[PDB]
Design a protein around this ligand. Structure first.
Ligand SMILES: Nc1ncnc2c1ncn2[C@@H]1O[C@H](COP(=O)(O)OP(=O)(O)OP(O)(O)=S)[C@@H](O)[C@H]1O
Ligand SMILES: Nc1ncnc2c1ncn2[C@@H]1O[C@H](COP(=O)(O)OP(=O)(O)OP(O)(O)=S)[C@@H](O)[C@H]1O
Lengths: 349, 352
């Protein structure tokens, strides 16, 4: 009997600064369990299913949320990608590949698989290139979206169980109850949102001028997104209609990174702490060193994923002579070490 | 007795609202189909024709909804196939014959009982060549799939494996006549309004003599479909042969502002009744006043996504409420005012 507060508390341990995103998942997860729990033999018939669309900046933690969810989730979960999908039975891949991947996690249990959750990454890769209907067939893009429409609403797709032993049959897999979380970092969406959010004005004398968009306000700008803007970006309205809900993720700032290095249990700081714990050596991270990493992380425009480059670059010299070194019990990383002027202080004990 | 067009439509009215034109067309075909089968066919009139239906309507107008509601009341077997996965010449994707075997699963492998079944093919527009494309490579999911359905719709015998085959020992197929099978092929066509305008607008008019069309008040999209003809679809990509097999057409009359309000209250499967049951098990009931729904209708039409895009308006409001509702105790009723939809205020909570 999980609750949004309990599930959010668990997710909060691994994610920070995504209060709006977390609420959406908690409701769907809570409602999905509630929907399946219901016998369906009641006044409410064919209860609706709310899908989710996770849009956010690069490296903001979208892919991480789906991974952490599967650990806590009891029902099966699968994480596919739309990069390999090709329409019309081409050589690349078919959409049915997503369903068979779910059974691998579910051990080929049809009744248990229909109640599963699905996640897709890099959904923007199939958006039309800001054009009108094409003059030719776009195998990857407009074509792929057309195929997913019926899958999201609910239908049965042929799937060989285990790939087939040697049977010549396929197992029907309902999808009316399956939830879908399609999310990927869209590029350039702010420029499109800027045009629509801005009222617009005529350049002549009589036409009034409107002073707006003084600051980019990226995080606050994506919140004003609507389906009509995505149509101009390349998505088909049919595909978005299948995804009523949407999630806007703020971009992490200098202060957000500091909390990510200490509060989460799987933080990189704690990883190295365990790396040296087995070696009989302790590790420490002072606040002055984390402040400098934040400024360097933003300088590389890579997000949280670009943080390891800064850490490994500093501890490189240390890690080269640490195993051979003996009688060392503690390592401290100061602010100077990041700049490279100094070396990390080692204590012998 | 037999089901009547008026009686069958009343059943559909419970699940569909504002589609009087479409309901009648479907009722007649279903009644005609039952009539043709009921008839022995060994009479003066023979080789009776089958009138197929072609449903053209915008997204979320209720095309897919009609097929599901029909199968519930319909006694004969029904299937919901799609032309998106079909590939011609037996390629690796899928074959057109797959539609037939799916029908038998509902019919329990009864050939005589299967020919009288009904089929609904969605996403039919997605297999049309748009225009002026490279001819070095032939279309596999475009111009080449419609050709395969021509013989199927007109009536031919297609080999089908029985149950997929227990082992190689059988190595046999089943022959199923399809001349009697009905086909309802419909999908939301994109960009059809632009081609129809060229024929019925003739108003670029930059010269003195030519007129000006008074642009921004003539884009009557829904009404524009009402004047559709087969020649317009040829420019869209459909082959005349495929259209000849589908004489009937049914404009959908997509949506009226007031229709959306009726869909949320009168239907049994309305969204309002869904959430009402969602909280009913939790010992909580929520009411939606009419003053709140009028604002919701205006927000949905602004999104240009149809009824399917309506949940976005509801869940965006009730997000914070549903997140902190279980933790709350002694709460028996919730009221949602117009302000809640706007976001200025919060939904009032009642304590028992
Ligand atoms: N809030 C966060 N707290 C802790 N680690 C985070 C956070 N956000 C991102 N990360 C780190 O970023 C890694 C990858 O996050 P992702 O979910 O891939 O971000 P992303 O924006 O989804 O990148 P994409 O989807 O591949 S473009 C995780 O394994 C974490 O190490
Ligand atoms: N007349 C209607 N009355 C009630 N609900 C409707 C009506 N029309 C559409 N809906 C809602 O819209 C949902 C989907 O409608 P569809 O039948 O899928 O429309 P559609 O034309 O098939 O869209 P496509 O072709 O699948 S993109 C239904 O499940 C209903 O919730």
């Amino acid at each position: 009997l999980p609750t949004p507060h309990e599930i959010r508390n668990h997710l909060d341990d691994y994610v920070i600064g995504q209060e709006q995103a977390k609420k959406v998942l908690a409701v769907a997860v809570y409602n999905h369990y509630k929907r399946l729990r219901n016998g369906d033999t009641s006044n409410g018939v064919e209860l609706g299913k709310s899908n989710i669309l996770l849009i956010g900046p690069t490296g903001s933690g979208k892919t991480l949320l789906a991974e952490t969810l599967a650990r806590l989730l009891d029902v099966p979960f699968t994480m596919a990608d739309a990069t390999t999908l090709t329409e019309a039975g081409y050589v690349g891949e078919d959409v049915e590949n997503i369903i068979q991947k779910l059974l691998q996690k579910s051990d080929y249990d049809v009744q248990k698989a229909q109640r599963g959750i699905v996640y897709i990454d890099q959904i923007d890769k199939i958006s039309r290139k800001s054009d009108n209907p094409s003059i030719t067939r776009d195998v990857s893009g407009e074509g792929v979206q057309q195929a997913l429409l019926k899958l999201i609403e609910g239908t049965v797709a042929a799937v060989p169980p285990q790939g087939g032993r040697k049977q010549q049959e396929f197992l029907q897999v309902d999808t009316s109850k399956i939830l879908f979380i399609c999310g990927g970092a869209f590029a350039g969406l702010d420029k499109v949102i800027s045009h629509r959010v801005e009222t617009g004005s005529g350049i002549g004398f009589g036409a009034t001028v409107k002073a707006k968009s003084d600051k980019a306000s990226e995080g606050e700008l994506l919140a004003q997104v609507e389906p009509e803007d995505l149509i101009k970006f390349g998505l088909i309205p049919e595909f978005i209609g299948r995804l009523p809900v949407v999630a806007t993720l703020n971009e992490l700032s200098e202060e957000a990174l500091i909390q990510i290095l200490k509060e989460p249990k799987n933080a990189l700081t704690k990883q190295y702490q365990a790396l040296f714990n087995l070696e009989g050596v302790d590790l420490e991270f002072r606040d002055e060193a984390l402040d400098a990493i934040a400024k360097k992380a933003m300088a590389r425009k890579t997000g949280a994923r670009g943080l390891r480059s800064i850490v490994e670059a500093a501890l490189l010299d240390t890690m080269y002579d640490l195993p051979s070194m003996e009688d060392v019990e503690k390592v401290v990383i100061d602010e100077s070490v990041i700049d490279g002027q100094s070396e990390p202080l080692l204590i012998y004990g």
